[PDB]
Amino acid sequence: EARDILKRPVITEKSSEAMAEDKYTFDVDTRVNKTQVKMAVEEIFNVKVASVNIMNYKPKKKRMGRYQGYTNKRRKAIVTLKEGSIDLF
Amino acid sequence: HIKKGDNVKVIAGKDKGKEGKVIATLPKKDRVVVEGVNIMKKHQKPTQLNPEGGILETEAAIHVSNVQLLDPKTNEPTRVGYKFVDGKKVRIAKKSGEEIKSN
Amino acid sequence: KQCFVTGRKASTGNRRSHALNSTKRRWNANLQKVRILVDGKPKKVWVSARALKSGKVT
Amino acid sequence: KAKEIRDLTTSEIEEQIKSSKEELFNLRFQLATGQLEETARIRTVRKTIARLKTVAREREIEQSKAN
RNA sequence: GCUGUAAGUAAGCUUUGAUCCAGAGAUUUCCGAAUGGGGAAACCCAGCAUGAGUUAUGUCAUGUUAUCGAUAUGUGAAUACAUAGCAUAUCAGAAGGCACACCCGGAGAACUGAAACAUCUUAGUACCCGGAGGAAGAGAAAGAAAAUUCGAUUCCCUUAGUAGCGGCGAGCGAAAUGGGAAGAGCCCAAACCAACAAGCUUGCUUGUUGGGGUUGUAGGACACUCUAGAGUUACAAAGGACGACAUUAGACGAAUCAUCUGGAAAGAUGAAUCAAAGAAGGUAAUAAUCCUGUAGUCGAAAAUGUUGUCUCUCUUGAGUGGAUCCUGAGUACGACGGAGCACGUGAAAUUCCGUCGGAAUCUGGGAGGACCAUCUCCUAAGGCUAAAUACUCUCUAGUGACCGAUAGUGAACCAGUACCGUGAGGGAAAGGUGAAAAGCACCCCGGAAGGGGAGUGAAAUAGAACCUGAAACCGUGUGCUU
RNA sequence: GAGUAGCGAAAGACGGGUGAGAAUCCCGUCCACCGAUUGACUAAGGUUUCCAGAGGAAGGCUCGUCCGCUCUGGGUUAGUCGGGUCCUAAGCUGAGGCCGACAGGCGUAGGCGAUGGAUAACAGGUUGAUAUUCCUGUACCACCUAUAAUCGUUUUAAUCGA
RNA sequence: AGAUAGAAAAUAGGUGCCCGUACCGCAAACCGACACAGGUAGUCAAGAUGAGAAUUCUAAGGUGAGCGAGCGAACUCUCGU
After folding, report:
1. CATH of A1-89, one of 2.130.10.10, 3.30.70.330, 3.30.420.40, 3.10.450.120
2. Using a CB-CB distance cutoff of 8 angstroms, which residues of chain A are in contact with residue D32?
3. Cα(B90)–Cα(B39) distance, integer angstroms
4. What residues are paired with A77 via a beta bridge?
5. How distant, in Å, are the alpha carbons of B11, B22, B37, B48, B74 from that of B18?
6. Cross-chain Cβ contact D33/A89 below 8 Å
7. Domain range for residue B52?
8. Which residues, numbered 26 to 85 in chain A, qualify as contacts with chain D under a Cβ-Cβ cut-off of 8 Å?
9. Closest in D22, D28, D30 to A89, CB measured
10. Rounded Cα–Cα distance for residues A66 and A85 (Å)
């Protein structure tokens, strides 16, 4: 726990623009709440977060060849830490 | 059945009465590639991994039913049996004594 | 709707006519509600009038 | 490689598992950032954590059986 | 050697025994009987306890918290005792699912047949529900028979489409005898009781504690006299301790070479060989001798069915009198109304159910197709019971004058899927390059799709929509016609 | 049948550009239509059709360089908005209970259930896609901790309450 | 009714979870098999004229309707005299 919920970071032009500010973006597990993400990040990176925002993305249709499928459901959290710097190197 | 690196003769295909050392086994399809057997002419296209290309002459696989081990004493085509040396299934040329398969 | 003593319950059969025309019918027990001594503490339950002919204590 | 794990004291097994969590998280994180180039180096730690938890279970089965 | 299908390119793992294959164990998210409350299943919201966290709050983790049952204690109304009722604790007690099969019950059609139709038939069928068990039902004579009893039950053949029942129409339709499969009899009440727990004054008595003995040669107590094998499939009922084959991985396993045609031979030709193996499938064509195997033999750490025993656990066996006593009550049986039995409240005797009545106790009771008298047989109204018998969701091995893609399953192929419908439901079409992917390097026209060379291949009118490639149909030439 | 019927209400013209190709795509000018709406919101429903690049087989009743099409990569941020959280109606369920051939039906206490009641955030900026959600400004509602300027038998109080 | 030695007061610090949020929504993304002349609750809804949410033109803002180019016969359809 506190490491199993941060699945991956999110890198993209909008995430990059957020990183211009102190907002960092992560791909978190689908069964967590804002408080738990705050705790986990401030536990790992030793940062002090000010706020965090969560959103749930629906499974998207993806056809691979002749077989249709669905992508996995996603839950994304945005942190806006004050002091500190999650480095994604 | 034969081993990964022994020397065998071929009895099927355009290649018969010819020796050569085995280079791959692929036991999931019982097809071996022997050296200098089934020479192939494959047209490879200029890509990124392969800068250019051409007509490669690689070896293709043949069914294990088309090859045979040689008697290490008399180069005589032979079958292969087994004997339990210290409980170990070691091989015999079935017309003479022990046959060595080290590489 | 059974008796707590005998077990006399209802049963099906046929109402037959003069022309032997058949319709389904039923035959019920003469079940009467009586306060008897079920396991000591008195209780009201259905009991047939043939089981009350001789043997039951109200 | 579960011999020395049986030889371990059952108290740093938690420490070993926690370090394995840490290293797996770091390496996966730098995979999604496109800086890993060592794929067999994920499955091996998954092996390691799996074995470490199996040994941990077998350890506590003892007192359940004995007591 | 491997990292499934699935190709790949990537990082790797492996002779230090991995990979794989079996046995065993551990992990086993969420929903669902769904069970902490709720709910549009795979989602929300909690109580309690204990821990993590935080200065604290928020937050999190793991137990626990449904309803019934039974058992056990608390407490305890209207009411005085006492009962409801409440409140706890415990318990692998119950729920749900399914094999579209088989079985036993509860309930119960209709089209149809009668060349109409109502009795009757379809039919105690279909469909519903409730139980099950691997089998179930039935079962040790109130049974057939005029016997000399197969001496329990069932099931197979025949009796026999007979006897019979039938608006005596349609049509239903036995049983006994005999021949076989199977080779099982077993316990409780009742009398009575040494002793004891309780009301009685030990005179009478109560009891489940237990003994007692369970049957028609009439059995048992009774009184005499007498004497210490069973079995967990009924016949009480538990479980360690040794073996024995078999089954959920496997191992060994005989004997062929040459030429010819070929793209390749297993074919043809010649010469051999093995066979407890010439079952079968592969292999570049048609193989007993090339491969996987086959006959034969061998083989389990383990976890199972199974079985020999050794334990173990149980424990009375008879006779003779026969004075008394006992032998299954609202029962048999009768009346009314219904069902069942091949047989239509009827002789329904045989037999059940509802409603009223309602018996005998061996010096008795029931049956022998209205029936009786006599004879013969039996002994009800309590219980248990394996085998022969029915069936196949499975698993294992194998078989087929069974189908070979409009067939055979609906489904040989991501099929109960496209799709259709609000839903119950309904439901398809669709296999085949080659031996090997060798899946067509380059060049030419074109934006590309295509093509034309060259090359691969035996073959490319085998180029991926790919084996053979018919007809309808559409074209391009033309010999003879108009 | 036949190169026949049909091409699904309507106003287009032209210059420039793009491309293998243009009445049909992009830009511009002019013209025209709606304007209690073909305009702006927001529900129900559909689920990715949303945005940026790229493509042109197929789908668009023609064409197509275009698109609600195809390929790749992206995009939905709330203590205050609407719900959960709070309440209940109609109905639906319903422990015990009543009735029922089985199945089950009914029903009390109690629950569920908005289309209603009660509830604290406004303006501006902002990208290709979001914004009472993000950011700037200023607020408000609950809750907790530290402190309190003395409320004062802790029965009453500063004041705690079914 | 009870319950209790406590915090209100004039501050200063912190904490505030799950779900929905794209897009269409008189529509080529919905119900009509279709890029269908039908149906689809509610809110805002300007100017001139008027009593008016009527009518004609227009503003804000959208749009030119997924086939066209000719010729202007018969015959149908819609419209005027």
Report:
1. 3.30.70.330
2. 8-9, 11, 27
3. 33
4. A26, A54
5. 8, 12, 9, 38, 16
6. yes
7. 1-103
8. 27, 44
9. D30
10. 45
